[PDB]
Structure 1
């Protein structure tokens, strides 16, 4: 990748970690007696970024016999930029009610936690049986509001990461690996956009 300063995680590494994480989620939900049709774990995929993690994670969950039901929502905050707008926009909410169900929000990354905080305060009022979160990437020290995800695949530095669903101006989401975008690349774009 010419635009990458460096590769954080290759596809195999990501695959390996998602497996371990799905195994834990399976052990943790064993006592809930999740079952298809009547008691699936509701996975809430936060678009656009969570699309790839969600696809690979539901399969790893399936490997461990954890029955799921997918809900796709869409929330926007960064837009074409590199930093939080300070605003979280709900572009698409769940199709069904989460009341009484075990819900697990699936996110690609958490930084300021404005997004997950907005989501949690919205969904908690809906009375789900339980509400947890799994984030592929966590920038621990980037919080503007506190938030502790239930499952973190990896902690990372505050630099701008792309690939595997993560974008910079709706680009690079397709990469198989997670990489650090060179500031010179995004700066040229930010400039051209300005």
Structure 2
């Protein structure tokens, strides 16, 4: 791992926390009567980074018997200095309607929050029975617009992290652990 300045979390620590987050979620929804086919917890996994987080979480949720529905969405930048408001081009949206459904947006990391806030406001207008967010890493200090995630696996300083789905120039997504990219490397 000589491209990393430090180890933030190992696969094990990540695993543990996810299970804790999943258990909290399960309790929080114990009342909503979530049932397969008719009333599942919809996970709108925001591609690409979220793919790894989403895979381990839906399984943790399953441990706690939470019936889920995976929706993968792919967004795209309109270009630098074109929106500011975090507007993104929807390349692939949910296959099913979220209207009347309990929805949970899944992101691997919230930093400036521009996109996540835009998405939250977007799905919010589609009238789901409820709408919350789960994010693996939260850079609380990086906000460019105010935004609070309902569930967070870990808060992190403003370091550039990689691994567990997170990349730098499309590299390192496959790492089992979350680490900090060495400044020597990204230079």
Moved more, 108-117 or 91-100: 91-100
Which 5+ residue runs of structure 2 have no aligned equivalent? Answer: none
3-state SS of paired residue (1:105): strand
* Contact 1:164 1:173 (8 Å CA) reproduced: yes
Moved more, 153-162 or 75-84: 75-84
The alpha-carbon distance between structure 1 residues 61 and 119, as it changes in their structure 2 partners (threshold 3 A), is same
TM-aligned CA deviation for residue 93 of structure 1:
1.1
CA distance in 1, matches of 2:170, 2:80: 7
TM-score, with normalisation over the residues of structure 2? 0.93
Moved more, 170-179 or 68-77: 68-77
* Contact 2:78 2:89 (8 Å CA) reproduced: no
TM-score, with normalisation over the residues of structure 1? 0.90
CA distance in 2, matches of 1:131, 1:114: 17
RMSD of aligned alpha carbons: 2.9
TM-aligned CA deviation for residue 76 of structure 1:
3.9
Which 5+ residue runs of structure 1 have no aligned equivalent? Answer: 187-193
The alpha-carbon distance between structure 1 residues 170 and 2, as it changes in their structure 2 partners (threshold 3 A), is same
Moved more, 81-90 or 96-105: 81-90
CA distance in 2, matches of 1:13, 1:83: 37
Where does structure 1 differ by over 3 angstroms across 4 or more consecutive aligned residues?
76-89
* Contact 1:22 1:60 (8 Å CA) reproduced: yes
Q: After superposition, what is the alpha-carbon deviation per residue over 1:24-69, rounded to whole angstroms, capped at 9, x for unaligned?
A: 0000000001011111000000000100000000000000000001
* Contact 1:80 1:170 (8 Å CA) reproduced: no
3-state SS of paired residue (1:16): helix
